Paper text:
14-3-3 proteins are dimeric proteins that have been shown to bind to the disordered regulatory (R) domain of [name], facilitate trafficking to the plasma membrane and enhance ion channel activity. 14-3-3 proteins have been shown to stabilize [name] and increase its biogenesis and activity. Here, we report the identification and mechanism of action of a macrocycle stabilizing the 14-3-3/[name] complex.
Diffraction-quality crystals could be optimized for the complex with [name] and the structure was solved at 1.76 Å. The 14-3-3β/CFTRpS753pS768/[name] complex crystallized as a tetramer in the asymmetric unit with two 14-3-3 dimers, two copies of the [name] peptide and two molecules of [name] with electron density covering the entire macrocyclic molecule. Of the 28 residues of the CFTRpS753pS768 peptide, 21 amino acids could be built into the model. [name] binds close to pS753 of the [name] peptide and establishes contacts to 14-3-3, as well as to the peptide. The tyrosine moiety of [name] is embedded in a shallow hydrophobic cleft formed by Pro750 and Ile752 of [name] and Leu229 of 14-3-3β. The two main ring thioether phenyls are engaged in a hydrophobic interaction with the hydrocarbon part of Arg58, Ser59 and Arg62 of 14-3-3. There is a polar interaction between the main chain nitrogen and carbonyl oxygen of Arg751 of [name] and the corresponding ring nitrogen and carbonyl of the tyrosine moiety of [name]. A third polar contact is established between the arginine moiety of [name] and Asn52 of 14-3-3β. The positions of P750 and R751 flip by around 180° and the side chains of L749 and R751 become visible in the electron density.
Numbering used by the authors:
A (entry chain D): -2 to 71, 74 to 232
B (entry chain C), C (entry chain A): -2 to 231
D (entry chain B): -2 to 205, 209 to 232
E (entry chain F): 748 to 758, 764 to 774
F (entry chain E): 751 to 755, 764 to 774
Amino acid sequence: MGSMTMDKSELVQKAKLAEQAERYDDMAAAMKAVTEQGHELSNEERNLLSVAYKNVVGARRSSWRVISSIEQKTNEKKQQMGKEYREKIEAELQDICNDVLELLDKYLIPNATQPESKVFYLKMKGDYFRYLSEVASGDNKQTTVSNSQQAYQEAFEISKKEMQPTHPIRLGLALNFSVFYYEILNSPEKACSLAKTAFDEAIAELDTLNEESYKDSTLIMQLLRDNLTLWTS
Amino acid sequence: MGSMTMDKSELVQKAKLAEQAERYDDMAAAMKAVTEQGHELSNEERNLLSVAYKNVVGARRSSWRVISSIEQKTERNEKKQQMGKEYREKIEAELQDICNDVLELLDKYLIPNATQPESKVFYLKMKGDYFRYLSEVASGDNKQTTVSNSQQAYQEAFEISKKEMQPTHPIRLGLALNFSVFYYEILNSPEKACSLAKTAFDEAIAELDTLNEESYKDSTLIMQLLRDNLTLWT
Amino acid sequence: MGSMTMDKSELVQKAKLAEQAERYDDMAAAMKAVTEQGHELSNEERNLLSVAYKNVVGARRSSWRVISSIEQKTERNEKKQQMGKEYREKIEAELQDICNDVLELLDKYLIPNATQPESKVFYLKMKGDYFRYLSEVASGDNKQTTVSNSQQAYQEAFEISKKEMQPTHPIRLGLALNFSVFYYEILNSPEKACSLAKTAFDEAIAELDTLNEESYKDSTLIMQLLRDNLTLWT
Amino acid sequence: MGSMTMDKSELVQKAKLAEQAERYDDMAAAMKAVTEQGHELSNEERNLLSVAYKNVVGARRSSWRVISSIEQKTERNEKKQQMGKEYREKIEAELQDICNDVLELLDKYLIPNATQPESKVFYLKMKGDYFRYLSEVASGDNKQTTVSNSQQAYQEAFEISKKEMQPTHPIRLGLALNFSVFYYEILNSPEKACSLAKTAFDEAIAELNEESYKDSTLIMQLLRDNLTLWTS
Amino acid sequence: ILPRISVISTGRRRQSVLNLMT
Amino acid sequence: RISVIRRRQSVLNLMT
């Protein structure tokens, strides 16, 4: 029929069907159209948009890592084909990320009315600028790196004032922001400091006797510990 | 000369990169272009072509099953059911287009350029397979056409393999495996499916008793699949 | 200093050679000697021990199923019946001895020395597994004992895993898989088995959606096994 | 009970059960006891005995190749090198015990009880085969004798087969196949190996029942495959 | 025989996370 | 269900 003649509920039903079918491009297109109608997303619609684009962008990020790795283990012929193929994937990745960042700037962030929603969407902006920064060369890198750091930093400040240390979004923001420091900024100390602080403050508040009730929090606490272990070994 | 100006070696290298990157649409496009150059494919190229299109069509087969399942469980919502129908039909059209491209390749290039029996059996089996995938979603008289075409391709490959190839040949064994699936799933004939599969397993094990099994590891793996399918089927 | 004069590093290297050579009785003997020297096993050594005994016992479980199926399909021939019974009982005694050695190691060395929850779930699952293997061939009051011991070990591992591990942890997933098999096959409770497997699958999928799946390929492999059992059982 | 109180029919039934159970050491033990009763083996008994030991010795040959391949990939660490050497020697000792048991059955029972030329060629080929398997792992000090013993058995089989059997007979063809493998791989004499295999093939192709045609052509194809591999 | 599969032998990248608040 | 897409030879004679 066409997305421009469809109600929000029909596009959401389409997104859910695409998700079950593991057709994430279809899922992303449906949720992009939902977002472009301009109304603040519900929690369910936010999750559908975020999962769709995580999978769409993630396929390209993973291909890019595979092709970059083959580029290094190599013959001028094979190495130039790998460079061209990588630039092919880079171009798709940049298009995907720019679409998401367009959605964030034009719809999601200016419609965010609650602090939890604002932290989430700022963390998302940081993430997708980080994904741009993973492949950005020379010049344009400085803008995406700065735009990533800025988005994370503002979410970091809201999260520490508005959220308890066991809150999964405060934990997840710290995790990804520390990854940004370690990998993009090559500041392993600050990355380790951020992750260890987040882990220590959460373990100080966590109800050890009802850990069953906080598996969303303990998941990211384990991820933070995993990264600290990996980085200090 | 036209829009595609890579030579065969460049295309094969790109197919290999796309396979590592799990980008099977790219991989299939590369191997389709290799095939359309019109030369007999090497075993390595034949496998790249086969693996690429198996992954491309397999994604649609998987999605089709999921959506068709959802479509038949929506008892009340006439609108979840109409949208599910249209989405299933969108996936079917993709599947039909993918199978069409493969069947085109087989009839234009692959089968007419096959001179050894091993190559004819491999491509006729492939023809049987892709008509079988069409049969999984076809209806009415189109299903009659696809089912008969699948069976005829399998039967021809079957008779060639029986006359020209040993029972331990992996291509002959793989043909027996997929042909039995055809009988079981498409023709709904489980006795025919079980008899084909056990006979192929039995004749292979009898011959392997005489041989050193070290150079037949790929035959043994397919025999284990025949074993597994028989376990499920009875 | 006594009969076993090799040190742990030599035994572990011997175990890895035996594995590559598909000599699993040798592999198990090496890793049993490692365990009996009191070392708390590393993750690598733990996996070697588990792979060794899985294959040692698996060979006997497979032979037992073959001989049992021959014995039960032997109607008129009496002497064949009695010979099949005696052969089955000889294989049963081997299987019982293998499981006894594993359970001895678990009760004497492995479980008492497991201080980390991951190790305790791993070894309690193993205890449940080997009592399950005994239950496959036991009868009478002995079967009552092995079924109860298997359930108790699985249940304790299960509770620990849900308190201390995330749904996506591969040891927690593999425990859910084998506990569901225990309900399905040993307790003949297919709906409870499906319910267990479906909750484990669904809770892992929901958590997996937040994660980079490339770091959890061992989890996704087991989730596919859960899904395959669900397909078979429904 | 025990093998020394079992009739031959019970031992054969035990061997067939062991085969189904993929318990080839049990299968060989049953058929060894059958052979040791001293009767000439039936066709079925011969097949069970040969298949059993093919698999028993074949497991060790496969393991020996795997460990040998590992050894040359770890030639720079002393503890792993000596572990590999000791483990290979353990496998070699099992292989040698298996082959010695078969060779003892051949010399004490199978070859002396063979009444027809076809049977004599079969068991002499088998003697050549199992001395060939000893030769595959033989130490430097023993290799000359095991290689000589293999060649002598194959040659006696070869002379009888040329006198008493049609070029098309699968046992004559199978002897030629394995003897040529002996020449190529053990005696490192590839010209003689190819000469032997080609002559055997060309002699059978000139003399080519639908059932006798099927069995002979399968081994003829194996001769062709080895010739192709060797002249490549 | 009722088919079923028990767990088979099983035998390093930093982690990031997406929050899916239900 | 599943569907799917050297060394010198020696031989053992198994007469029937």
